């Protein structure tokens, strides 16, 4: 038994060329077992790209090619296109006849301008409060790249418990969205002067705040 390592992620800009390696060992690749490549976007089934190290099925474009040497294999893609953004997996076997997949490499295609997130914070509603509970909702959207840090504060202290935050996911417009929820008792809610959701993105930090009927 053994494994196949793949770099978790790779990038390149459109029209350029990138390479994705698959590193195995004397027990799979090194022993003669062949390597196949699949391309994958989760809302779809995988697609066979290359088989038996360097073979390409018909239907599969020119731009994709494979090579192999010693205990490693590699996949090259030229003329990067948007549509090439996806996960790519190498796959081989071992002396059991168990197929073995590598961890996957997600490829990112450069070229999209940075985008600052719009952040929206909502306090608990009376209704939920009447039901003896309180949920604060921090909504974060339209940002790129897909990386963001979320932080909460009661007055000036950092709150850690009762927080649930989604990893971000790409929307149809190519930008990301994420959410963070803070679960509190109605006693804490009324016990502090304000709560804040702070979001950091690429050097930018925006912070929104809410307070219990601080009406006036």
């Amino acid at each position: 038994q053994n494994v196949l390592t793949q770099p978790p992620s790779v990038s390149g800009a459109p029209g350029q060329r990138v390479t994705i390696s698959c590193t195995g060992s004397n027990s799979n690749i090194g022993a003669g077992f062949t390597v196949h490549w699949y391309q994958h976007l989760p809302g779809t089934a995988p697609k066979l790209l290359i088989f038996a190290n360097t073979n390409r099925p018909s239907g599969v474009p020119d731009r994709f090619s494979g090579s192999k040497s010693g205990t490693s294999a590699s996949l090259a893609i030229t003329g990067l296109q948007a549509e090439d953004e996806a996960d790519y997996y190498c796959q081989s076997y071992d002396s059991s006849l168990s197929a073995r997949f590598g961890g996957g490499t997600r490829l990112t295609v450069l070229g999209q301008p940075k985008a600052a997130p719009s952040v929206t914070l909502f306090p608990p509603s009376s209704e939920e409060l009447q039901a003896n509970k309180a949920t604060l909702v921090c909504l974060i959207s339209d940002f790129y790249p897909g990386a963001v840090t979320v932080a909460w504060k009661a007055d000036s202290s950092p709150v850690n418990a009762g927080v649930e935050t989604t990893k971000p996911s790409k929307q149809s417009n190519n930008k990301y969205a994420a959410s963070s929820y803070l679960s509190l008792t109605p006693e804490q809610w009324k016990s502090h002067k304000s709560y804040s959701c702070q979001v950091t993105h690429e050097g930018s930090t925006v912070e929104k705040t809410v307070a219990p009927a601080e009406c006036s």
Binding site: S98, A99, F122, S179, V210
Partner: protein, 226 residues
Amino acid sequence: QVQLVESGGGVVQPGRSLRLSCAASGFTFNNYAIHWVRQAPGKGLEWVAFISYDGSKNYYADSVKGRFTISRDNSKNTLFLQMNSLRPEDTAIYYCARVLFQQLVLYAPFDIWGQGTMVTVSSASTKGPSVFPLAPSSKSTSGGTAALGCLVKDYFPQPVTVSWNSGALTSGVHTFPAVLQSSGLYSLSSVVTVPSSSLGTQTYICNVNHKPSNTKVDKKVEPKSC
């Protein structure tokens, strides 16, 4: 047309059993080996099992050995994956895939794949959601426009569907992906952006539908006045 279609996934409690199926059409099934592959949440593809063209042979990943059984019926174009003693760690979308070459060829690639079927192993129980209004305010008002929404709380399992004004309002709406609480239940929020100069003159109601528990909720959202 060649095609593989898996069936039988759904929600289950740990320790129970579930049998999935994969039916072929468009080609001579008895001439090919078939495999099952799965992909857990946030994880990569993982090979599960395989069975030879004539069923005389089979094999399994170490992670299912002893719990899963593969089998096929060469009189009906169907293959089966019997899963017993399911664990939360078996949660995944499962795919069946055919190899490229007929009969006993080895190391052949996976050329045709079905669309997969989802299996969720949880202890949670089916629960419709609680729905609360997220009222608009100066606190998030007049950017010229205002933001208001519906918070859809504690439900299981996915998915939920939200619409506003019964389909009539479709622009400005943004439904966020659900969060999985540690409690095993999900929560999500749907927001809409609207002209802040007509609030109160216009009515907004979010329509929430949770198929799994046969619960629909309508909730009007209104600007308070604290």
